[PDB]
Paper text:
Sorcin (Soluble resistance-related calcium binding protein) is a calcium binding oncoprotein expressed at high levels in several human tumours, such as leukaemia, gastric, breast and ovarian cancers. Each monomer of Sorcin homodimer is formed by two domains, i.e. a flexible, glycine-rich N-terminal domain and a C-terminal calcium-binding domain (SCBD), endowed with five EF-hands3031. The SCBD can be divided in two regions: EF1–3 (residues 33–134), which binds calcium with high affinity, and EF4–5 (residues 135–198), which mediates dimerization. Upon calcium binding Sorcin undergoes a large conformational change that allows it to bind and regulate a series of target proteins in a calcium-dependent fashion.
To investigate the structural basis of Sorcin activation and of selective calcium-dependent signal transduction, we here solved the structure of the apo Sorcin (apoSor) and, for the first time, the structure of Sorcin in the calcium-bound form (CaSor). Briefly, the monomer is formed by two domains: a Gly-rich N-terminal domain (residues 1–32), partially visible in both apo and calcium-bound structures (residues 30–32 and 26–32, respectively), and a calcium binding domain (SCBD), containing eight α-helices (A-H) organised in five calcium binding motifs (EF1-EF5). Indeed, the rmsd values measured by superimposing CaSor to the apoSor clearly indicate that upon calcium binding Sorcin undergoes a large conformational change, mainly involving EF1, EF2 and EF3. The comparison between apoSor and the calcium-bound Sorcin structures sheds light on the mechanism of cation-mediated structural changes of Sorcin, which is fundamental for the comprehension of its function. The superimposition between the CaSor and apoSor shed light on the mechanism of Sorcin activation induced by the calcium binding to EF3: the binding of the cation promotes the movement of three calcium ligands (Asp113, Asp115 and Ser117) towards the E-helix where Glu124, the bidentate ligand, is located and consequently, a large movement of the D helix with respect to the E helix (about 15°). This movement is transmitted to the EF1-EF2 subdomain via the Tyr 67 placed in a strategic position, in the middle of the loop connecting EF1 to EF2, and anchoring the EF1-EF2 subdomain to the EF3 loop.
Author numbering:
A (entry chain A), B (entry chain A): 30 to 198
The structure:
């Protein structure tokens, strides 16, 4: 069995059960350099990542999930860079719209406006907020799709299931 | 017409249109001392507050909304203090459950677990995360109730409306 190059970072912070929480993910994401020159992800953003991958509200994730996370974040960063050619670490609401669309998110104009207002300061969205945005979008889209068993694009949400689901991200 | 004691803090940071964004709210919340000894609210948490009150994704709020916000946060802080008598600035998942229940949130046990995992580090929830939790809970509960026109406790969410709504908080 081949050694995976991500394993050292993970093994150095995992608990006794072979899992990591948000705090430990924060550390191994920073050591592993996934942000590649941009500001490293804060604890809050790492909590969102944990929920996106564990999809079970344990607050922890295993190595296989860490590897999947790492590949997803690597691709999102490359995508961001194609809009941030000068590497400012920011992007504007027009660039954000086009960035979200091209990565497979299907969003009405007012959905995009909701998102721009949510994450912009001074007409700009940081790399870190862009990633947080993508993590939460993918987690919520996975949650919605999971529940849309009839594939109608509409989900019937009981209140407590809605709260459970949306408060995890 | 009587002067309101909150107006000075608001007027010092409002834009030309008489509204404030999250950044300006952050400043006037800190100057106004609403956190009362606990750590002042960060920008992200102030973004959630703006969405809770404006309920329209403009990213801004007026003075009347600021006043309502201030009263809501004052009551939540008092409520927190009744569980944080020694004023550690933290609370544990058992205290959090009872705190949420007594302030009128109706949450199943697994909804509460979702929330504890989402905000706890080392078995503790900070005052600032408690407030963020309450802001998001009230905003999402308002969003759900608004849409539950038949009062069945179930809402039919189209995907883009779901995303719009949940990405604002």
């Amino acid at each position: 069995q081949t050694q995976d190059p991500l394993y050292g970072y993970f093994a150095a912070v995992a608990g006794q059960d072979g899992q990591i929480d948000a705090d430990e993910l924060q550390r191994c994401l920073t050591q592993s350099g996934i942000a590649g020159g941009y500001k490293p992800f804060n604890l809050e953003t790492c909590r969102l990542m944990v929920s996106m991958l564990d999809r079970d509200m344990s607050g922890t994730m295993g190595f296989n999930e860490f590897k999947e996370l790492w590949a997803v974040l690597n691709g999102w960063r490359q995508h961001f860079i194609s809009f941030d050619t000068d590497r400012s670490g920011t992007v504007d609401p027009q660039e954000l719209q086009k960035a979200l669309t091209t990565m497979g998110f299907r969003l009405s104009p007012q959905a995009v406006n909701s998102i721009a207002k949510r994450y912009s300061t001074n007409g700009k969205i940081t790399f870190d907020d862009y990633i947080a945005c993508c993590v939460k979008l993918r987690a919520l889209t996975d949650s919605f799709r999971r529940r849309d068993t009839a594939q109608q694009g509409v989900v019937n949400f009981p209140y407590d299931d809605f709260i459970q689901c949306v408060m995890s991200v």
